[model samples]
Target: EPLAIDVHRDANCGCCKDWIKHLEANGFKVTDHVEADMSAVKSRLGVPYSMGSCHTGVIDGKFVEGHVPAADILKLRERADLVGAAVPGMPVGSPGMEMGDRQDAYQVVGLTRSGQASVLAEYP
Candidate 1:
């Protein structure tokens, strides 16, 4: 079965749209919700403040809370022990936050139900 991701983002944000396309291009079935109040959406989805990002995605009850890559999401799917994963702030090289061949170093963090975060993947 294809992975289904429900994304909540600000309607006016272009980066969010790019992230959705990134996931879709990777074979994820994406359903995007453009809302005026992204903070409320994040709160409703239980995304931690430290783990917050520009957009939020939910898959199989786990929060994908940022510009997380499709590969990380697939890795997350195999781990039932996590609350979700996050990319923290918008990084220059993250899937959605890409800029002309400038890939910044960043980390993909796996979040726990208790609000702890651990590095899942690192990009240099």
Candidate 2:
């Protein structure tokens, strides 16, 4: 059975579609939601406005923000105390924000239910 992800995105954002495709390619079933006010959605999902990106997704009852890689999302399943994971901003090297050649270093930050934020993964 494929894992299901509810992705909330802006219709005008191209990166959102690419990110969704990444999830699909990684064996996840995505339910897309086109949102008008992403800020509200981010707040509702407990993603800090500072960590905002082109899209957000809910998987295993936890929020995923920005261009988090597929492995991290899968890893999220094991984190019972985490509220979600985020790769703040559209890092050039991250999934969906990919450029042809250069890719920027990024980190996948995990936020706990208690609001403690920690680094879950790092790409250098």
Candidate 3:
């Protein structure tokens, strides 16, 4: 089954659209909710403001935040016990976090509200 993604994005954000296309191109079923009050959306999902990003996605009850790589999402699908993962703060090297080819070294952390985060993966 195609993964279902609920994307909450601001109407004026262009990069968010490109990010959605990136996911769709990788076979994610992107269902977008264009809302001006992204703060409310983030709050509703229990995502801390400290963890906010350009858009948020929820798949199978787990919150996928920021520029999460599609491969990580696949890993989440396999690990049913995980609460979810976040790329926090739009690092330049993460999946859609890319900008013009110059990529920064960064890590994607797998975390839970319960507070355990293993270095799920990293990029440069």
Best-performing candidate as measured by lDDT = 2
Residue 10 in model 3: lDDT: 66
Candidate 1 C-alpha error for residue 31, in Å: 0.7
- Candidates ranked, most accurate by TM-score first: 2, 1, 3
lDDT of 2 by residue, 28-117 (tens): 999997988888888988998688778889987799998999999878879888889999888897888888889898899999978898
Range of the 10 consecutive residues with the lowest summed lDDT in candidate 2: 74-83
**Model 3 TM-score relative to the real fold:** 0.85
* Candidate 1 lDDT tens digits, 1-124: 6779999886678888999999999999999878778888788777877778888899999888889999999988888778788888788989988988898798988877777777889998
Clashes of 1: 0
RMSD of each: 1.4, 1.2, 1.9
State in Å the error of residue 30, model 3.
0.8
My TM-score estimates for the predictions, one after another, are: 0.91, 0.93, 0.85
TM-score of 1: 0.91
Each prediction's Cα lDDT score?
0.86, 0.88, 0.77
